[PDB]
């Protein structure tokens, strides 16, 4: 498993460019921000609900513990 | 004439290890937590040594020696808090690494996954023992409870308890032997980590897409060396906020009290990285059931490679399974928080429900979801 | 029980530090009030030098106290003036003697209460100032006192910080709050003497990291810019 | 489909290192010591851990801890004396190993030879710290003398000595750091021994004749493995005789007096296995010259592949050179005895001549003689 | 200068597989308790080790309670004095080293928990020492308080003659001859230094037997599995 | 380095017998004792002399030391 015999590929053309000639931060904010928002929207629907369920059970548990450790039936 | 890098034995090993290893280009940030682990381990190997040279593992000087390190030793407090918060960050990185393995289906590399489970076991034992070392009230009482748990095993469970204790209770012999084992074990961790890497190299890392990336591999030396340098430095950022600004933020203040086998502390907990298992422990009323659940909570990672039924090995393209995975993560955090709280209403029922839900997700929801998943995609 | 309140300490800020004049003031609070019954053992007069007292003042303070050490040429304990290296003298030779002198409770080793108690200084300060009268229906065994902030709501402390208890060196009035704040700050320092140095290292680290993250990030992006600009092209026959 | 011995990635190295390793057919017993070292190290690791099980590296309790090991702990005396005599036996096998390397021309293997020199250095340092640990009179005073020897270094002498001491004299800090260093170093020795084996396996082995045995290699498993086991049994015989019939035969009784930094013992002789250098240290009147001679006595092994000039690799066929080598061994024994003896009239001059002749054999006599037989054998 | 070395006495335990006479240990404990314990100490040996070696449990308990040993702070605030029990080490005669030095002429009676494993020569030394007291030779004038013992390094030991004929009455009735007392106390001190002396030797015995059995068979195995190479009988047949 | 890339050899015939038909101790003493005597004869004259001169040096040092520790007329 070293370079030279990984697999077989044909008719692929890859162009590149020296790191000393092209910019290190190309459109970091012009294109970075919309891409970040798109990636956020892609996964927020499947990420948030489990954690907001946690937040709900957390607030309910703390407030119920506070309520239980109180005085009423006497 | 031959290049020394690829001809000298040691240089050949290092070259294949982390110089010219063909690695996928789309390796995300979540793989950095591999190297970071070793880095913390190295730091954990280092700082502990510098702690070990001012620690007298005796129950009459252990706490005094620790105070001596923190107070009357040139830049000793830095070393001590580096050790503690480095343990916290080591477990953070370990949990993130296990999550990465679960998500992107890296358990398909069988031997690496089994070795990882062994590493998790031994490193958690090491951390427990190390936390016993400072000999605070929390240290002593947590040690008593955790070792006493072993009494649940039938017949020979009772005899192991004094054997590990070295006497009839957690006392001189327990502290000294815990120091000895805590010293030796991390080198065993290092050996098992070397074997882990050895096993990983024979197949290569798994890209986020899961599909084999043998047509896109890139050399390690120019690209990932700097990426892991960035990752390690970024981790050091958080570690230095931990040590330098709020060192005792992760740790019960009661530990800063000389251990006294005559006064249980009002609040009893293991460390933040153990509370999750303590939750299942206190969930099962039966003691033997509790110990078996403790073992199973970690060992269930060994069943994960078998339970994988989805035709995709990567979770990038599994929305329902993704929601299940994040529900599992929330379940683990809920277990940790419940372990933090005392066993009262409504924490008891929440703990039972969280334990059942965690086991149910890992064993049943994920495979059934994978099956309906494959049915949904013509395979 | 109620948790401690977030007091706005002068040493509370992220980059803030303690007030060493307040540290000096709280040290005499310990010396003239706590040391009679309380046992601070992990710190020594050597630590006093340079934190709040100069070398000669600390030496004189040490020489004021009498300490028991060393056997003479007759195998006997001999008293001697405290030198710069003696740890703060314990008031009770054995821990059980402390219980015997009081109703049966042990004054904890004040070296670490700021670090040992859940709440830190805010607790102990509220422990001393936040004394009160036992509400109706509450019984209390003779000898115990009522302090809500204490877990269990029944303290064995005689109220020790009563007004005009001492005379501060600089001349600040020794009112309830003033003396309580001084001793609380001194106890915080005794809990961890490296607070000032810790914040100094943190200050250096903040800008060192804020300068290394951008540069290492630029390094990584420059090295990876080869791949971040490849343009694959398929040319099948 | 394929033998697991040569299919499993972990089993590959083990099979190629101990099972199917081509070894010379005419290997004598002098090579068995190569195993005897490694096995012995494990006992030192195995025993040394259990000593660390019950040991408080504190000035006021270290000796008490050792006595409690040898008197109270179940069979603690067995472990303690097994450990000490195992260290002595380890040095016996180390000297025999170096002698074998010198004789049968193994220093032609370069990388293994230098790695072995590093191994020797690390092992001697480890033994020094170990003898420091019991905190007896000889322990403390020998440690003081040997660390004071470092003051001979110009300029940085005193600061380096005070650094190693951890303070102003051998005290709490010195013992506490020595224990941790003694814990870590043997694992460095283990990793370096793995490197030693890795380097050796690439060049096969040197048979007693010295000619290449590439055409008479034999499988390792049915062969020497059993012979190595037999050698290990003989080694166990010697070690068990030493432990069970005279535990303190190789050890000064004065160590059993608790270390008192007020009374200089009548003699400050170090362990038996260091005097050969210590005597050299006594020979040179100059302190810095003494330290340089002491270190160069061990370092001279590195120059050996350079000084060899005889066109025959081995010493099997060089009679005069064999007489020279046995003169060298006699010189080593004489140096050990001289180091044992005090610094008086009859011993000073004997030590001078012993040191001079020991250096002269290695540097001058052996190569000059190696020229002689080459001229004698028409080449 | 000179160092008169102790002649090798033929001790009963000197033998390769010979253990100490435990009755001699019982006798040698009494002399330590009634003579040597007056100024010397055996801090590393407790009454517990005595049982099963030269005393039974009830005698050990009675002997332990014969003396008074200090226990921790009572419920009032001070030391409370209690009779000894099994788990109490041998009482120190002097409160601290300084008291020991001052009480004597200025020297220090070394603890005997290791005096046989610390002195070059062992029992042969101590016995001879206790029996080596004599009038100093002419030309030597020791200071008042110093006593002459050739075996002691420097010949100027600060030890009053510890053993004289009929110093104590042995319970079994053996004569109190100085030689007998010294022999028994030296055996006891050797046992104190090396408590495992019996078992070690016993273990050694077994190691002698089975390794006398394993070594041939393993060798017999080697020649078994190595005979193929030792009977090769090569041959060369070039064209 | 494993078996196969070791050497080139030709016309060498090697016989052998199983360990199960050849006595593991074939005339042990009868041929061993002359063999050991020959081996000792080969090397004694080149091994022993340095050791015996060491013995002489050691004994000589022992007395010379203790004579130096003896008295002296005065
Ligand atoms: C403990 C945790 C911390 C320590 C361990 C860290 C391990 C990973 C560190 C190394 C690593 O993976 O670096 C590459 C990794 C991902 O690639 P990248 O460096 O962003 O390079 C551009 C992407 O390839 C492509 O990203 P893009 O297309 O969105 O464009 C660039 C940029 C867009 O940024 C913005 O738009 C700026 C928003 C403000 O993307 C970002 O995610 C911004 C990262 C910096 C903030 O770096 C980061 O994610 C930032 C640093 C890593 C920690 C996370 C911080 C949040
Ligand atoms: C200190 C650290 C520990 C040192 C010892 C452990 C490391 C070395 C281990 C060497 C080893 O496993 O085998 C060496 C060495 C390898 O040669 P071998 O297997 O004896 O075969 C005979 C030779 O080819 C040489 O044959 P040969 O020409 O002398 O005549 C045949 C045979 C017969 O000669 C004798 O048996 C000598 C006569 C007296 C018996 O020779 C021997 O048996 C020589 C060995 C001494 C007996 O074997 C022994 O030394 C045998 C063990 C000692 C005797 C049996 C004790 C029970
Ligand atoms: C003819 O060559 C050879 C031998 O015997 C003459 C051998 O025995 C062996 C085999 C030797 C060993 C297994 C023991 C020595 C090896 C080491 C100390 C390296 C570390 C590896 C271990 C398994 C031992 C330490 C384990 C743990 C701490 C080798 C390689 C060899 O080359
Ligand atoms: C983006 C937010 C900041 C991230 C961290 C930046 C660290 C310093 C990076 C650097 O050297 O330059 C950053 C920026 C862009 O640099 P670059 O992509 O090389 O383009 C300009 C030169 N041709 O160039 C500059 O900021 C100044 C360039 C002159
Ligand atoms: C970080 C929080 C944000 C996050 O994870 O967002 C989800 C995002 C998805 O990334 P990706 O897999 O590319 O999305 C494919 C969509 N079809 O990113 C991911 O899903 C990547 C992270 C996957 C899980 C990595 C392991 C750590 C998870 C958190 C800790 C869990 C600890 C307990 C479990 C072990
Ligand atoms: C006493 C020390 C020697 C014990 C073994 C006896 C001995 O040295 O026997 C001689 C033996 C001969 O070895 P060999 O290679 O057969 O000699 C051929 C000569 N033409 O000599 C050898 O095999 C030489 C072995 C040298 C290395 C081990 C002994 C020296 C260890 C020094 C430390
Ligand atoms: C004459 C006795 C006495 C005096 C005066 C006294 N204490 Fe105490 N203190 C005690 C005892 C006993 C306890 C433990 C039980 C109580 O209640 C205690 C408890 C404490 C605690 C631990 C509270 C907790 O949460 O358990 C702190 C902190 C403390 N004291 C500090 C002080 C300070 C600061 C002063 C005066 C400036 C002071 N004490 C005066 C005897 C005293
Ligand atoms: C596997 C990596 C390691 C982890 C996760 C780890 C974890 C810990 C933890 C959590 C503590 C308790 C810290 C505290 O309560 O203050 C601790 C203490 C300690 N560890 Fe480790 N440790 C590791 C490696 C080592 C090593 C290799 C050594 C020996 C060289 C060592 C020596 C010590 C010592 C002496 C202490 C007591 C000092 C103290 O607690 O502050 N550790 N360790
Ligand atoms: C002792 C701590 C550990 C160390 C030092 C360690 C080391 C590494 C390293 C450096 C990598 C390569 C980087 C990466 O892919 O993340 C890796 C990969 C891996 N490790 Fe670990 N590991 C540790 C713990 C674990 C654990 C607990 C598991 C899970 C049981 C595990 C399973 C894996 C898997 C499956 C991979 C392959 C990841 C992939 O292919 O994408 N490791 N390990
Ligand atoms: C390289 C192999 C080793 C050598 C040569 C070695 C050598 C020694 C020696 C000569 C002593 C003095 C024993 C005595 O005077 O009674 C000693 C003591 C000690 N060694 Fe080691 N040792 C080794 C490995 C280890 C290891 C790996 C450990 C820890 C796991 C260890 C722990 C100790 C301890 C705790 C002591 C003090 C107790 C004692 O005096 O025996 N040793 N060692
Ligand atoms: C930590 C202690 C050491 C261990 C565990 C060790 C291990 C080994 C082993 C197992 C062998 C193969 C068996 C043999 O040929 O004897 C070997 C060979 C060798 N070792 Fe070492 N060794 C150690 C120390 C040294 C030292 C001190 C030197 C010399 C500086 C050295 C140089 C060599 C050489 C030259 C060989 C090749 C011998 C030959 O095959 O002819 N080693 N070592």
- What resolution in angstroms does the PDB record give? 3.6
Distance CA E184, CA E26 (A): 8
User: What is the SS3 assignment for E181?
Assistant: helix
b/e sequence B315-328, b meaning 16+ C-beta within 10 Å: beebeebbbbbbbb
Give the CA count within 13 Å in the CB-facing half-sphere of C9: 27
Closest C-alpha residue for ligand 1 atom 27? A32
Experimental method: cryo-EM
Q: Cβ distance D280 to D355 under 8 Å?
A: yes
* Strand duo F12-14 + E68-73: pairing: unpaired
Q: How far is CA C1 from CA A27, B4, D233, F52, in A?
A: 56, 70, 69, 89
| Angle at B170 (CA atoms; ends B167, B174), nearest 5 degrees | 75
Cβ count near B215 (within 10 Å): 10
Distance CA C109, CA D62 (A): 28
Q: Cβ distance B332 to B358 under 8 Å?
A: yes
- B62 CB burial (10 A radius; 0-12, 13-18, 19+): buried
B316's enclosing H/E stretch is: none
Q: How far is CA C157 from CA B358, C162, D283, D330, E52, in A?
A: 48, 12, 71, 79, 54
Question: What sign results for the dihedral spanned by CA atoms D184, D190, D195, D199?
Answer: positive
| Angle at E41 (CA atoms; ends E40, E46), nearest 5 degrees | 155
E39's enclosing H/E stretch is: none
Residue of F15, F11, F2 lying closest to D218 (CA atoms): F2
* Strand duo E79-83 + C77-81: pairing: unpaired
b/e sequence D37-67, b meaning 16+ C-beta within 10 Å: bbbbbebbeebbbbbbbbbbbbbebbbebbb
Distance CA C5, CA E186 (A): 72
Which parts of chain E fold into alpha helices (H)? Answer: 22-34, 47-50, 57-66, 97-103, 115-118, 123-130, 178-193, 197-230
Q: Cβ distance C179 to C166 under 8 Å?
A: yes
A70 pocket-lining for ligand 4 (C-beta < 6 Å): no
B256's enclosing H/E stretch is: none
C193 touches chain B (CB under 8 A): yes
Question: What sign results for the dihedral spanned by CA atoms E126, E127, E131, E134?
Answer: negative
The backbone torsions φ and ψ at residue A18, rounded to the nearest 5 degrees and listed phi first, read -60, 140
Q: Which of C2, C151, C229 would best serve as a mutation to test chain A binding (most A beta carbons within 10 A)?
A: C229
Q: How far is CA C112 from CA B280, C118, C147, C190, E226, in A?
A: 33, 12, 21, 7, 70
Q: Cβ distance C190 to C11 under 8 Å?
A: no
Give the CA count within 13 Å in the CB-facing half-sphere of B180: 21
CB contacts of B58 in chain D (<8 Å) are 56, 58, 61
| Angle at E149 (CA atoms; ends E147, E151), nearest 5 degrees | 155
Distance CA B227, CA C38 (A): 55
Contacts of E143 (CB under 8 A, 6+ apart): E156
Q: Cβ distance C180 to C129 under 8 Å?
A: yes
| Angle at D312 (CA atoms; ends D306, D314), nearest 5 degrees | 85
- D338 CB burial (10 A radius; 0-12, 13-18, 19+): buried
Distance CA F31, CA F57 (A): 38
Q: How far is CA D326 from the centre of its chain?
A: 19
CB contacts of F11 in chain E (<8 Å) are 236-239
Cβ count near F50 (within 10 Å): 20
Of E77, E99, E100, Cβ closest to residue C94: E77
Cβ within 8 Å, pair B330-A54: yes
Which residues does chain D break after (C to N > 2.5 Å)? Answer: none
Cβ count near D293 (within 10 Å): 18
Q: In chain A, which among 29-68 make CB contacts under 8 A with chain B?
A: 43, 46-47, 49-51, 53-54, 57-58, 61, 64-65, 68
Find out whether the peptide bond into B51 is cis, omega within 30 degrees of 0. no
CB contacts of D177 in chain B (<8 Å) are 53-54
Cβ within 8 Å, pair E1-F17: no
Of B22, B219, B346, Cβ closest to residue A61: B346
Distance CA C111, CA C123 (A): 15
D201 as an active site residue: the answer is: yes
F12's enclosing H/E stretch is: strand F12-14
Concatenate the DSSP letters of all residues of E79-137 into one string: EEEEE--TT-BPPPSSSSHHHHHHHSSS-----TTSHHHHSTTTHHHHHHHHT---PPP
Pocket test for ligand 10, best of D46, D130, D242, D250 (most atoms within 8 A of CB): D130
E237 touches chain F (CB under 8 A): yes
D202 as an active site residue: the answer is: no
| Angle at D199 (CA atoms; ends D196, D200), nearest 5 degrees | 85
Of F15, F17, F24, Cβ closest to residue E223: F24
Q: Cβ distance A24 to C218 under 8 Å?
A: yes
Distance CA E64, CA E89 (A): 9
Closest-approaching ligand to the CA atom of D119: 11
Concatenate the DSSP letters of all residues of D195-219 into one string: HHHHHHHTT----TT-S--TTS-B-
Q: Cβ distance C10 to C18 under 8 Å?
A: yes
> Chains with 3 or more CB pairs closer than 8 angstroms to B?
A, C, D
Q: Measured in angstroms, how far is the CA atom of residue C68 from the centroid of ligand 6?
A: 67
CB contacts of E78 in chain C (<8 Å) are 97
Question: What sign results for the dihedral spanned by CA atoms C44, C50, C55, C56?
Answer: negative
Binding residues of C: 34, 37-38, 117, 123, 156-157
Residue of D378, D379, D328 lying closest to D354 (CA atoms): D328
Q: Measured in angstroms, how far is the CA atom of residue D223 from the centroid of ligand 2?
A: 15
Distance CA D254, CA D266 (A): 9
Of A11, A22, A25, Cβ closest to residue C229: A22
Q: In chain F, which among 26-65 make CB contacts under 8 A with chain E?
A: none
Concatenate the DSSP letters of all residues of D125-179 into one string: HHHHHHHHTT-BHHHHHHHHHHHHGGGGSTTTHHHHHHHHHTSSSSSHHHHHHHH
Closest C-alpha residue for ligand 8 atom 43? B130
Catalytic residues of B, by residue number, are 201, 205, 227-228, 271
Distance CA D251, CA D244 (A): 15
Q: Cβ distance D158 to D250 under 8 Å?
A: no
E68's enclosing H/E stretch is: strand E68-73
Pocket test for ligand 3, best of D11, D15, D35, D229 (most atoms within 8 A of CB): D35
Concatenate the DSSP letters of all residues of D39-106 into one string: HHHHHHHHHHHHHHHT----TTTHHHHHHHHHHTSTTHHHHHHHHHHHHHHHHHHHHHHHHHHHHTTG
């Amino acid at each position: 498993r070293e370079f030279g015999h990984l697999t077989r590929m044909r008719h692929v053309i890859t162009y590149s460019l020296s790191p000393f000639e092209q910019r290190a931060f190309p459109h970091y904010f012009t294109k970075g921000i919309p891409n970040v928002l798109r990636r956020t929207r892609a996964c927020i629907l499947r990420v948030a609900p489990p954690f907001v369920v946690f937040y709900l059970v957390y607030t309910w548990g703390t407030q119920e513990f506070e309520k239980s450790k109180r005085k009423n039936p006497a | 004439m031959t290049n020394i890098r690829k001809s000298h034995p040691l240089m050949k090993i290092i070259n294949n290890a982390f110089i010219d290893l063909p690695a996928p280009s789309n390796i995300s940030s979540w793989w950095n937590f591999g190297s970071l682990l070793g880095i913390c381990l190295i730091l954990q190997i280092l700082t502990g040594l510098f702690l070990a040279m001012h620690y007298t593992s005796d129950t009459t000087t252990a706490f005094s020696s620790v105070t001596h390190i923190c107070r009357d030793v040139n830049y000793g407090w830095v070393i001590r808090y580096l050790h503690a918060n480095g343990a916290s960050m080591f477990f953070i990185c370990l949990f993130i690494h296990v999550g990465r393995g679960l998500y992107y289906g890296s358990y398909m590399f069988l031997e690496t996954w089994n070795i990882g489970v062994v590493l998790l076991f031994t490193v958690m034992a090491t951390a427990f023992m190390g936390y016993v070392l400072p000999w605070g009230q929390m240290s002593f009482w947590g040690a008593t409870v955790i070792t006493n748990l072993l009494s649940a095993i039938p017949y020979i469970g009772t005899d192991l308890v004094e054997w590990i204790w070295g006497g009839f209770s957690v006392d001189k012999a327990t502290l000294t032997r815990f120091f000895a084992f805590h010293f030796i074990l991390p080198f065993i961790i290092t050996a098992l980590a070397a074997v882990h890497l050895l096993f990983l190299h024979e197949t290569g890392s798994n890209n986020p897409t899961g599909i084999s990336s043998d047509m896109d591999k890139i050399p390690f030396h120019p690209y990932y060396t700097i990426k892991d340098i960035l990752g390690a430095l970024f981790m050091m950022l958080i570690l230095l906020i931990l040590v330098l600004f709020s060192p005792d933020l992760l740790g019960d203040p009661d530990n800063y009290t000389p251990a006294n086998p005559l006064n249980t502390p009002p609040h009893i907990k293991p460390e933040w990285y153990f509370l999750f298992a303590y939750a299942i422990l206190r969930s099962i009323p039966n003691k033997l059931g509790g110990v078996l659940a403790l073992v199973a909570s970690i060992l269930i990672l060994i069943l994960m490679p078998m339970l994988h039924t989805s035709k995709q090995r990567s979770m990038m393209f599994r929305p329902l399974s993704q929601c299940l995975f994040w529900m599992l993560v929330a379940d683990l955090i809920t277990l940790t928080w419940i372990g933090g709280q005392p066993v009262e209403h409504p924490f008891i029922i929440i703990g039972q429900l969280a334990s059942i839900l965690y086991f149910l997700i890992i064993l049943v929801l994920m495979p059934i979801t994978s099956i309906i998943e494959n049915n949904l995609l013509k395979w | 029980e109620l948790h401690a309140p977030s007091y706005p300490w002068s040493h509370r800020g992220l980059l803030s530090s303690l007030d060493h004049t307040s540290i000096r003031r709280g040290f005499q609070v310990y010396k003239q009030v706590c040391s009679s019954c309380h046992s601070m053992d992990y710190v020594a007069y050597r630590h006093l030098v340079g934190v709040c007292y100069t070398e000669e003042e600390a030496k004189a303070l040490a020489e004021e106290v009498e300490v028991q050490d060393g056997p003479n040429e007759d195998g006997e304990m001999f008293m001697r003036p405290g030198k710069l290296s003696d740890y703060f003298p314990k008031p009770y030779p054995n821990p059980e003697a402390a219980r015997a002198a009081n109703n049966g409770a042990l004054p904890p080793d004040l070296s670490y209460i700021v670090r040992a108690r859940h709440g830190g200084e805010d607790y102990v300060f509220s422990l001393l100032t936040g004394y009160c009268e036992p509400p109706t229906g509450v019984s209390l065994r003779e000898g115990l006192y009522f302090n809500p902030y204490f877990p269990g709501q029944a303290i064995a402390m005689a109220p020790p910080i009563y007004n005009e208890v001492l005379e501060f060196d600089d001349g600040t009035p020794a009112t309830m709050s003033q003396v309580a704040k001084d001793v609380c700050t001194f106890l915080r320092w005794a809990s961890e003497p490296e607070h000032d140095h810790r914040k100094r290292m943190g200050l250096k680290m903040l800008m060192m990291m804020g300068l290394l993250l951008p540069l290492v990030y630029a390094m990584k992006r420059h090295k990876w810019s080869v791949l971040k600009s490849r343009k694959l092209a398929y040319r099948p026959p």
